[PDB]
Design a protein around this ligand. Sequence first.
Ligand SMILES: [K+]
Ligand SMILES: [K+]
Ligand SMILES: [K+]
Ligand SMILES: [K+]
Ligand SMILES: [Mg+2]
Ligand SMILES: [Mg+2]
Ligand SMILES: [Mg+2]
Ligand SMILES: [Mg+2]
Ligand SMILES: [Mg+2]
Ligand SMILES: [Mg+2]
Ligand SMILES: [Mg+2]
Ligand SMILES: [Mg+2]
Ligand SMILES: [Mg+2]
Ligand SMILES: [Mg+2]
Ligand SMILES: [Mg+2]
Ligand SMILES: [Mg+2]
Ligand SMILES: [Mg+2]
Ligand SMILES: [Mg+2]
Ligand SMILES: [Mg+2]
Ligand SMILES: [Zn+2]
Lengths: 104, 50, 126, 75, 67
Amino acid sequence: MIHKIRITLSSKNVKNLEKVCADLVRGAKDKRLRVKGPVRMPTKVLNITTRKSPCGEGTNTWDRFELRVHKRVIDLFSSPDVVKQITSITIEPGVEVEVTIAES
Amino acid sequence: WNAHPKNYGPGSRTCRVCGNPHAIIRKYGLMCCRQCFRSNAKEIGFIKYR
Amino acid sequence: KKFSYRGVDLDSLLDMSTDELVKLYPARPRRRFQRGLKRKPMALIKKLRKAKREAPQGEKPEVVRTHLRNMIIVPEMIGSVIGIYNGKTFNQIEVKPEMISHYLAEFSISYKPVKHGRPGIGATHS
Amino acid sequence: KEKVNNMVLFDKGTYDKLITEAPKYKLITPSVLSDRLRISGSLARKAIRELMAKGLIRMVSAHASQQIYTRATNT
Amino acid sequence: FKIPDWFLNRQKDYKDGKFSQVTSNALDMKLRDDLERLKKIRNHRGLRHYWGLRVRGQHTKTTGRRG
RNA sequence: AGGCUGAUAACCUA
RNA sequence: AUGUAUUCAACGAGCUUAUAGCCUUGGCCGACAGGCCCGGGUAAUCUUUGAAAUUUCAUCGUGAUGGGGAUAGAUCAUUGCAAUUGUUGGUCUUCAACGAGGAAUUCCUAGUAAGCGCGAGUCAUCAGCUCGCGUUGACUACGUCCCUGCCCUUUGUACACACC
RNA sequence: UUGACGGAAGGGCACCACCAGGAGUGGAGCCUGCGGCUUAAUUUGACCAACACGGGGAAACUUACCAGGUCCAGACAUAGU
Ligand SMILES: [K+]
Ligand SMILES: [K+]
Ligand SMILES: [K+]
Ligand SMILES: [K+]
Ligand SMILES: [Mg+2]
Ligand SMILES: [Mg+2]
Ligand SMILES: [Mg+2]
Ligand SMILES: [Mg+2]
Ligand SMILES: [Mg+2]
Ligand SMILES: [Mg+2]
Ligand SMILES: [Mg+2]
Ligand SMILES: [Mg+2]
Ligand SMILES: [Mg+2]
Ligand SMILES: [Mg+2]
Ligand SMILES: [Mg+2]
Ligand SMILES: [Mg+2]
Ligand SMILES: [Mg+2]
Ligand SMILES: [Mg+2]
Ligand SMILES: [Mg+2]
Ligand SMILES: [Zn+2]
């Protein structure tokens, strides 16, 4: 009857990601569901380092470009229909929500 | 006409923005030349911190 | 003092099968034939031995010009006259038994050997 | 700069010198014997083992890079 | 003595096809025959041996200046 | 021939 | 230096699943290079149980020597439509200069210099390069305007294309 | 008058300056870039602030150079055959 449902959140914006995570945990604590998380995975730092000059003249200066990806994992012990109800709330822009039935 | 194989090497790949074959950034599947990437970096989501 | 390749005399090399020949060749030609030959290499072999059939008895065959300088020399090509393009001109050679397992590129030099002239202005004080 | 000529095997004269004089050294190492007896370091290493077997010299330190020995009995 | 073929400095000889270890003058004769064969057919590698140039694809603009 | 000089002369080295 | 034994990182990167195109564990075949098979991973999940210098024992013994590994011969395999003017990777052999570098000249003040390896970019194949990462870990100074320059003030100027 | 400059002065400052030092580089072999020479061509930009720089590690492609062969990927409009 009760299953461990895994919700994964990804975003470049920490504040928006943390806001949605709190809305889900707090939205599940209202239904008295058992909640595991949020678990914060290590931040993925995509990095592109490139020559600033469009030509090859001058001092060789470099731009270090970083695109950070933050990932959260929340496990809810409940039925899929109940979880579908909690996650159906409008989510902040740029936060990618992904609901899967944990294979355990 | 265009018979020569184009399965690998610089001749197969080009910049997705401008079409130039040089200095392509293939990391993460960007497929942009280094000049076009710097112009579009902010829009793509890349940022300079240090 | 007849020619022999890997202990096999020239008379037997002509009658040997392609599978038997590849074992005699070094590693690079063996991989090349194992990967197969394309249309263009086949056509050259067809023309090279066609010229031999047209040659009057006792005369060398007529020249066959080709751009295929990655072609490998096989025993069937011994005695043929081939003009090998070097990028500018067709350099003519007569295939000899010691050329077996070499590329045609190795007998048509693509550059002129350097004979130096006097250094110009800007060659020193560097 | 002259070249050293270190013997690779002992001769009767030098071997007897090793058995009599070397036990009296305060410091015994392959390089000490190699220089005093004009023997190669390879021969000195084997010689020190023989002196150890005979009990003429005792060990102070053992390291693959540096071996230190000394006379078994003082003076 | 069961020394394998891959361990020998003359593997699959050009003339005989045999495997052997060639030493002293026989080794010097073998090297002489290799270069004479290439020079005789006017092989590119043989010609560069004859001209005293590098034969293994090295750049020659800046290194090997001993003349 | 090299070095020194933005460069030449001078100077220094080989 | 070589041959053993021993042993500790960090940044990061990874696939179309087509029999399978990326990172590859495990098993088997092979001296190596490499090959075959069963698989994992679109990843804090699998590769990742994840380095070298160093430590340790032995051999070598001041000899251009077991320092050095250029040049060159033979041969094998891999990438590719194609390797010759050697793509690269192996095996045996070959075994050059070089014994610490003239005038001159660069960088650097602490986890720094230097040494040591690793990832990433390029990339079918190719790193002596670049951008990062950690590991080992110092000497000297705590000043000065002598040299090369810079900033401010006063001052001289026939310079203003501005002491080239 | 303002600047710039001074083998003018005063004050201050910097390991792209020095001092005290370390590692070196410059010498050898080789890798790679530049010049010159050669070449059918050895494409080319750049001369502290050019020269492992053009992310430039080019087998083809890249490619601009050289020797050759194709193709039209000549819209649209007017007239003609
Ligand atoms: K040269
Ligand atoms: K070698
Ligand atoms: K030096
Ligand atoms: K540079
Ligand atoms: Mg070359
Ligand atoms: Mg050695
Ligand atoms: Mg570990
Ligand atoms: Mg030696
Ligand atoms: Mg290349
Ligand atoms: Mg580069
Ligand atoms: Mg200071
Ligand atoms: Mg300086
Ligand atoms: Mg100093
Ligand atoms: Mg050095
Ligand atoms: Mg020099
Ligand atoms: Mg030097
Ligand atoms: Mg400056
Ligand atoms: Mg080309
Ligand atoms: Mg072309
Ligand atoms: Zn572009």
